Structures are given as C-alpha cells and as structure tokens.
From a paper:
PEAK pseudokinases regulate cell migration, invasion and proliferation by recruiting key signaling proteins to the cytoskeleton. PEAK proteins are a unique group of pseudokinase (PsK) scaffolds that can self-assemble regulatory networks. In addition to the conserved PsK and SHED domains, all PEAK proteins have an N-terminal intrinsically disordered region (IDR) replete with short linear motifs (SLiMs)—conserved sequence motifs that can that form dynamically regulated docking sites to recruit interactors involved in PEAK signaling. Here, we elucidate the molecular details of key PEAK signaling interactions with the adapter proteins CrkII and Grb2 and the scaffold protein 14-3-3.
Author numbering:
A (entry chain B): 66 to 72
B (entry chain A): 33 to 72, 76 to 232
The structure:
Amino acid sequence: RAASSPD
Amino acid sequence: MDVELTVEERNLLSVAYKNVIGARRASWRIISSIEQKEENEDKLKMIREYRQMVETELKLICCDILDVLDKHLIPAANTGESKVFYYKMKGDYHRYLAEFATGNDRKEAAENSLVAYKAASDIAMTELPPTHPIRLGLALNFSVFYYEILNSPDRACRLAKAAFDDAIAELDTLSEESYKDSTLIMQLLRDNLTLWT
C-alpha cells in the first residue's frame, strides 16, 4: 500500500 | 565468525533474497484477502492451512537472514556505507516479520525494526551525504516503517520530506553519473509523500 526501496 | 562482502556481492545477494521474500509477501497478502472474503467449513480451513504454511516459510527465511546479519555481517562492517546498509537490512527484515506477526510478537519485531532503523540513521546522518542512495533508501524504508507498521503518518511524512529536501538541496553539487542513482529513490519518496498527504 506504500512503496519501499527497490532491491 | 566474520565475513566481509564487496558492494557487488552484498547487492546481488540482497536482490536475490528480497526477490524471494517479496514473492512470499505478495502470496501472503493474497491468501489473507481470500481468507477475509470467504470468512464474510472445509475451504476456509484449507485456506488457513495455506496461510499458516506461508507465514512459517517467511519466518524461516527472515529469521535465518537476521541471524546471518547478526552473527556474521553486521560485526564485520568497516565502511559506514556497509554499516548503514546492513542495519537497514536488519530493520527491513524485522519489518517483514512484523507485517504478519500476531500478538506480542508483532510488538517484538516492531521494536527490533525501529532499533535497527534508528541505528542506521545515526550513522547515515553523520557518514553519508543526503544524496547517497543508501541513505535515501534507508529514509524511504524507515518512513514506510513509520506509516504502515507504527501507524504514524506524521513521523513518516516528516522523515520523507526531510530526506527529500536535504537531497534536493545537495543535488546541485553532484555528478550526473553519481546522481542518476539517487533520482529513483528520491522520486519514490516524493510519490509516497503525495500519496500519504
């Protein structure tokens, strides 16, 4: 529901 | 009991493990959505049996990764970049544990997440430029932790805005070939802000 850091 | 990883090695291992963990997380969310709809005899049971089957695997991975962070990787971190990286990883995996933990476990994990995140922050703000991709990813995941776990949109938006403004300030004095990286995390932070607000 909310974007975290790309990994 | 010590291991040191080059930036490339730890980046590649991180990509692999978080690919796996994201697959499992999305599967868990979908099984939960199925459970909620059917709840609103034998089907639901099996559904729960799959959810309990997912939760276990997830845990087994996250726990197993955190051990390797604590017993091996975090102690053997010279550069501040790698220190912030490993502490952010610890916070991220404790966050994933809290995302589905029930009871005081959800409390437990949450604490161990924050203590990790704060840790990385206390290094980043004194070791990495505001433009550094590690620091920006840390701030983004930390604001996500604030908004979604601790249910604090205020602290989340505060952290996101602070990180974005410090970045956009130090942006003018930054090489292009060293700013194209920060671009994407900065834009993600901006999108998260526009959504939360």
